[PDB]
Amino acid sequence: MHYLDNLLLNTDSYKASHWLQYPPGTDASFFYVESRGGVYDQTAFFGLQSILKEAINRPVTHADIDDAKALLAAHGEPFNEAGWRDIVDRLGGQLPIRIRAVPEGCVVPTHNVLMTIESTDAKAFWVPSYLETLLLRVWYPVTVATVSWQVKQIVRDFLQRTSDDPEGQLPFKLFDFGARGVSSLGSAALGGAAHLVNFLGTDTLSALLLARAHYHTPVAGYSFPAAVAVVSDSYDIYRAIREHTLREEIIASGATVFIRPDSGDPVDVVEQCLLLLDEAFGHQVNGKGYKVLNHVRVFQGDGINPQSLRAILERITAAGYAADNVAFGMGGALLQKVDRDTQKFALKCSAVRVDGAWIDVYSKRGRLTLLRDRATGQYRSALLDEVATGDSDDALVTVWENGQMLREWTLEQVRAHADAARL
Amino acid sequence: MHYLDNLLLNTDSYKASHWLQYPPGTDASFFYVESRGGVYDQTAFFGLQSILKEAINRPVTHADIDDAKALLAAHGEPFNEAGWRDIVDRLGGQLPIRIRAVPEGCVVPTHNVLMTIESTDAKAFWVPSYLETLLLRVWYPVTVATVSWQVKQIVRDFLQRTSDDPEGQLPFKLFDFGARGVSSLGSAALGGAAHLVNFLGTDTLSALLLARAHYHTPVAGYSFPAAEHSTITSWGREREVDAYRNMLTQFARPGAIVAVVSDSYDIYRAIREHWGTTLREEIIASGATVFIRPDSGDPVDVVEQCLLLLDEAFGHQVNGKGYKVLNHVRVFQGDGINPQSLRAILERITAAGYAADNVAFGMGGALLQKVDRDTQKFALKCSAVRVDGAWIDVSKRGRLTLLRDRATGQYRSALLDEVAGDSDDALVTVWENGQMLREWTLEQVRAHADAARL
């Protein structure tokens, strides 16, 4: 934990010597962050707040410069000792950058400006590029939140078709079990938090801690206890029904027994357990005309991904069973099987000021922002010189400037913005 | 950082309530960790030491029990306050387990015991199950160390065939630059170190920090300065020569390595248009090694294409193997590199007559991020529990260890009751009851891994 407490060493090695590459007379730089495309056409922005709280949690000190100058020397990189000491002494160790971003939770289509980073000091103009490495890692919470959100839209579709209470049923249909299948503890926390943007169920306790620490939400999610959750193979409802009357506390305690298989094809086993359970406890028909099992539910934790989950939901509703009957769990397929290429996540330089003049660097160019249309709500990237010309708002807000986080969200605010977005 | 400082909450939610599901009269549990196949047939064991140093860094406190009791109650899971308060009171907050593992760096064939966790107390027999979630995440440093190692064996082959100094050329052939394409800071550090088991090149500074903090290696890796393509452009189309000229002015010192970026078509232009014919100055005059990194073209072709273009611009010498080695310049390919594409490049350029010395690789997301727990089908399984003083079994069953054959050096899993001769127990007790009994320097880790071949 404490051995990583040096912001000056939280970058790519070649960044320590990057300021020497600028043309003479540079005094400002402007960067933006976009998803160039990939699996989905829209991304739920989330995570930057957690990143800034943890990666930039205190002013840079002279001890930071001392330790970094030593290592980077031995490591093989020139290090701007003058510029960093100037930041500690002149700017009080507060990074001279301004970060604007779309509110965390908003779902924005790809190829659009999600963040902008701009230097606020002429001497330390190079600080944005230095911070590119740790800021670009916002791809991960963004990408996980998008996955959990895209899955939410699949279940919302089927609940709306087959459930008498879709929006009540929905927040408990995806549980994150990915703590063991993720690359590190911090990734479990942050990534697990990205899932909590869309659902209330998670077994990643580390997501609870980060949500409370970085988003002011004490108990952001709930979980499943087992021993009512019970494990099975699919062929034990097959057995215990007609090779018996284990209707012992199931009907007597009146509890909701969640039957979870762990073997078989994710689509077939779910339909099998539904049918078997229907022949063991009966069912009732809701207002939509779909059957809802009595007491028993099915939980599928194995083999769930967005495509296999849609397959399951298609099969069971065509059989006449409401989406209320099942719930899903995703583990590694939610927190680990994603990368920066999944949504083609980039941080691009768009503008530098050289000799008092801004010049374009080149997909998008110049000093940019995100606009939201007042009537339709649709998004489009545009230049800062275009916020004046009125049936449009600047969709970004300054969240961080010169050491002070200017805008914070609660996880409930984030959940609100994600839940309003559909499709 | 500090908000995670509670071991009691570093697990799956249902694992906090797992002690309720043992039979009555249980007084011991025994678990093992294996890779049950996957992409590769062998895995380089690494990372467990860092995991234990960071995840278990202090005794369990009563405050920890207070917070975990409160949260798990609101969250919806039973929490064994009784067992944990007894551990803090009686066992001084020291986890009553013993962890044995193969020495970090060893490359072990899949389907073999790599770790064993056993309880050392009759009351707190369930502690291993509780620690399963954090321990199983050893899949990540094992998988990344294996990936870097499998790539090393590929480069070793073509260096052995085409280079006059293979083992000297090898440790700088794969640079990890994936600090930006990894899921978090902690994964960057631990993952970057897993790659440092096999190579000396990295831009992941956080790997240096973890290697210094958890593996007693002060400066475990080295880097060179490299030209960013966005920054060169800012100089303007007019002063584009002057950008590279300054690039050499800052970093191109005699024994130094400097990396510049261009495309397939600029090197083509520079040669037969003479626009930068003045630019062979202080590439040659500096005596530095200028790495040319492409940003356009097919990842396999641009390597050979740059080699040929550079072969004209700077000439070459023919080594003892008969393979050409460019003067001053080298090629660095960081885009699209994976074990199979890297093998493709080396196949192409050597068949063209160029020694593997000419090229060097960087991997980003494909090394630190494009891996999962299924990559090596990594498992943690209970194999034995003691019930009423009697051990009962739960691929493998019973209480297990790893054996290495004295003559061949081959590995096989076996029962503890079977160390009866001409084989040594390949495991060592690294952690027991709060004490880390064995630690390794990264160089000790590097030594074990470098000896394994194929």
Author numbering:
A (entry chain B): 1 to 227, 258 to 274, 278 to 395, 406 to 432, 435 to 468
B (entry chain A): 1 to 394, 406 to 431, 435 to 468
Task: Quote the authors verbatim.
Nicotinamide phosphoribosyltransferase (NAMPT) plays an important role in the biosynthesis of nicotinamide adenine dinucleotide (NAD+) via the nicotinamide (NAM) salvage pathway. Here, we demonstrated the NAMPT-mediated salvage pathway is functional in the Gram-negative phytopathogenic bacterium Xanthomonas campestris pv. campestris (Xcc) for the synthesis of NAD+, and the enzyme activity of NAMPT in this bacterium is significantly higher than that of human NAMPT in vitro. Specifically, we revealed the presence of a NAM binding tunnel that connects the active site, and this tunnel is essential for both catalysis and inhibitor binding.
To completely block the tunnel, which had a large diameter, we made multiple substitutions using bulky aromatic residues simultaneously. This led to the creation of the H175F-I224F-V291F-I332F mutant, where four residues were each replaced by a phenylalanine. The crystal structure of this quadruple mutant was determined (3.11 Å), which confirmed that the tunnel had been successfully blocked. Consequently, the binding of NAM to this site would be either significantly reduced or completely lost in the mutant. Consistent with the positively cooperative model and the existence of two NAM binding sites, the hill coefficient of the quadruple mutant dropped to 1.00, indicating a loss of positive cooperativity after blocking the tunnel.
